[PDB]
């Protein structure tokens, strides 16, 4: 249904003269871009990462980012000077930005900033502003960033028009990968006495894993977290604490859209 496009930036300022800035980009749970500090240039991590942008557009868009990156770095450094000694390195800024797409030609866009791990600032409407909980001192940084009318129009253009446009193009070019089905594989194991159902290789992320005595879903099951594999598939496991000896006749039913109808049943 509702894909989210996410440009995650993370920058680290060690001291007055050492910084570094690295971004990666997601469409749902699939990486589309990656931009290393030591790269002058943004990298497609998918054949369709350029979207339905012509080259001209991409090159201008990328060039906007190339400039921003350099500009971003100095400004933080100057902002730390303006504040000091109230604030001092090491500093970690992180941005998260993009748009979420909906039925119709409908979308919300966001741009959230975080400082030392706490979400504090966002672009919203027409300007930056702090969110609830933020320190009052940010009011000077924010007053300054809001002085720059040129940045405001640009950011407003990226959020209101460019992101939804671009991401709408991405979803056309990516249909194949985005709608991929990969079949899970499963194995059983145990430890102190905990039965364990391993499931691995499945795409997309929704999946149902339950331990069962016959047709009776053993309710004590514990779903683990979704861990990724490197090939863009998922891994997940379900455990069941059981009295030693009671293993007989337990199965592990796994449901997935990959598996057209026929489920995976594993007996102990």
């Amino acid at each position, epitope marked *: 249904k509702n894909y989210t496009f996410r440009c995650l930036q993370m920058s680290s300022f060690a001291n007055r003269s050492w910084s570094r800035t690295d971004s990666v980009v997601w469409l749902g749970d699939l990486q589309t871009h990656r931009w290393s500090n030591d790269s002058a240039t943004i990298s497609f991590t998918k054949p369709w990462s350029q979207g339905k942008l012509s080259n001209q557009q991409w090159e201008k868009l990328q060039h906007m980012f190339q*400039v921003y990156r350099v*500009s971003f770095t100095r400004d933080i450094q*100057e902002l730390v*000077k*303006m504040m000091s000694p109230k604030e001092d390195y090491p500093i970690e800024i992180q941005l998260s930005a993009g748009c979420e797409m909906y039925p119709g030609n409908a979308s919300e866009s966001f741009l959230h900033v975080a400082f030392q791990g706490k979400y504090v600032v966002r672009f919203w409407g027409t300007s930056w502003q702090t969110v609830p909980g933020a320190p009052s001192w940010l009011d000077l940084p924010i*007053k*300054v960033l809001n*002085a*720059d009318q040129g940045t405001s129009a640009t950011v407003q253009m990226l959020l209101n028009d460019t992101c939804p446009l671009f991401v709408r193009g991405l979803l056309e070019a990516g249909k194949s990968d985005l709608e991929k089905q990969e079949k899970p594989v499963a194995w059983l194991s145990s430890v102190p006495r905990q039965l364990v159902c391993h499931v691995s290789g499945f795409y997309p992320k929704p999946v149902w894993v339950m331990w069962m005595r016959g047709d009776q879903e053993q309710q004590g099951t514990h779903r683990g977290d979704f861990l990724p594999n490197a090939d863009e598939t998922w891994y997940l496991q379900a455990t069941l604490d059981v009295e030693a000896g009671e293993e007989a006749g337990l199965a592990c039913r796994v449901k997935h859209s990959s598996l057209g109808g026929q489920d995976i049943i594993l007996y102990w």
Partner: T-cell receptor
Amino acid sequence: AAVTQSPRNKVAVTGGKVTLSCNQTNNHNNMYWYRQDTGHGLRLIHYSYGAGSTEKGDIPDGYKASRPSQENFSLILELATPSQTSVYFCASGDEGYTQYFGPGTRLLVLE
Amino acid sequence: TQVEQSPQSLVVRQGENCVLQCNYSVTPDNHLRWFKQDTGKGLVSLTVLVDQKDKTSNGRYSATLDKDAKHSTLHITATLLDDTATYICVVGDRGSALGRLHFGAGTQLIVIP
């Protein structure tokens, strides 16, 4: 939005202390010191973002800077030098981009 | 030298028109400002251009800016003797106090009376 500089003109000797003062009433957080030398633009020496701060600019060597207050940004030369013969310019501004320049001060450092 | 101006100097009979050129590599280029400096005095602003292609005027001074080309001009119509002065190009790299200004070395005008 005004900015003043004193002195406006100084003859000085190598080794002497020289102090160039700038003063502004506009309540401008930020203040800057440049020097103008034939065949270059103005180059920034020190600047300040408010009372208590001073930042190194593009050619800070030989100059120490002092912001005792919102009103005063002073440039100090502990050991003057013939190479510091120049025309010095102070500026202030608030959070936006315009910098309001002073009338300039002339320094001549003789042997 | 990210702000180059041209010509380094020029002489003109009062009444005549003249144009001054400023070329820059500065990045980014939020705004370009043309200052005027009388021999012995300090810096009077004449105009500041802010858009991608921009035109401005201040009495007998007009000016352009093309940001794609990174190029500005300054046209003085019908020069007067008081125009004898140095004209200085300045490029600001932000629309806030976070910016640094980058100064050309000016163009020395002399108007013959």
